[PDB]
C-alpha cells in the first residue's frame, strides 16, 4: 500500500515530534530559572478560569510545565536558553524594553504552544480519517489527498518552528557575550529591527497552520 505507507510515515513522525517535546531526559530548570525568574517570565502569565493562570515564573506546576515549553521551543538545550536569559535579564534593566521582552517571549511560547496542538490535531484527524476509510465513508483517493495535506501542515510547522529558533540562534550568536555591557535601546533597537518581525511571524504562521486543520 502506498496508502499505507503514506499514513504510517505521518504517525511515525507525529510520535518522534511528540517524543521530542518531552524528552527531557533528566532535563533540570536552573533556579533562578535561565536568568528569566525575574526578568522575561516576570512579565506574562501562563499562556494556554484565566484569573487563576499563574504567572509564568512562579512556583506553581502549570507555570512549571509552561516554562518547559520555552524550553522545548529551544531543544533542551541549557545554554543557548541561558544565553538567551541572559539577553533576556539585560533588556529588562529599563522598562522601556519590557513590553519587547514580554513581545519576545509571546512569538516563542506561542510557536510552541501552537505547534504542539498542531501535533495533537494532526494526531486526532489521522484516526479519524482512517475510521471514515475503514467505515467506507471516503475512498483511499480522499484518505490520500486527506493525508497529503495533513502532512504539508506538519511540514509547515516544523519549518516554522526551526525559523524561530534560528532568529534566537543569530541572536545569541551576537549579543549573549555582551549584552548588559551594551547600551540598551541600542540592544533593544537591533532585535527590533533584525529579529522582532521573523519571531512574530514564525508564530502567526504555525498559529495559522494549526487553526486549519481543525
Not at 512562579?58 to 538545550?77: G, I, V
Not at 514580554?102 to 506561542?110: D, K, N, Q, T, V
Request: glycine letters at 2%; proline letters at 1%; hydrophobic letters at 35%.
Amino acid at each position: 500500500s502506498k496508502l499505507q505507507t503514506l499514513k504510517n510515515e505521518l504517525i511515525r513522525a507525529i510520535s518522534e515530534e511528540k517524543n521530542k517535546t518531552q524528552n527531557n531526559f533528566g532535563f533540570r530548570e536552573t533556579y533562578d530559572q535561565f536568568k528569566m525568574k525575574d526578568s522575561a517570565f516576570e512579565l506574562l502569565d501562563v499562556i494556554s478560569d484565566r484569573s487563576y493562570a499563574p504567572q509564568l515564573n512562579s512556583n506553581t506546576p502549570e507555570a512549571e510545565n509552561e516554562r518547559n515549553k520555552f524550553y522545548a521551543l529551544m531543544d533542551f538545550d541549557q545554554y543557548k536558553i541561558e544565553q538567551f536569559g541572559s539577553i533576556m535579564e539585560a533588556l529588562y534593566n529599563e522598562n522601556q524594553n519590557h513590553s519587547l521582552i514580554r513581545e519576545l517571549m509571546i512569538s516563542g511560547l506561542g510557536t510552541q504552544i501552537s505547534f504542539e496542538l498542531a501535533l495533537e490535531e494532526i494526531n486526532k484527524k489521522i484516526e479519524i480519517f482512517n475510521q471514515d476509510y475503514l467505515n467506507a465513508k471516503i475512498n483511499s483517493f480522499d484518505f490520500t489527498m486527506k493525508l497529503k495535506e495533513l502532512k504539508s501542515k506538519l511540514n509547515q510547522i516544523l519549518d516554522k518552528r526551526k525559523e524561530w529558533s534560528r532568529q534566537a540562534d543569530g541572536l545569541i550568536a551576537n549579543a549573549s557575550s555582551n549584552s548588559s555591557l551594551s547600551d540598551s535601546k541600542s540592544l533593544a533597537e537591533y532585535i527590533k529591527k533584525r529579529y522582532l518581525d521573523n519571531m512574530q511571524n514564525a508564530r502567526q504562521s504555525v498559529l495559522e497552520a494549526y487553526i486549519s486543520i481543525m
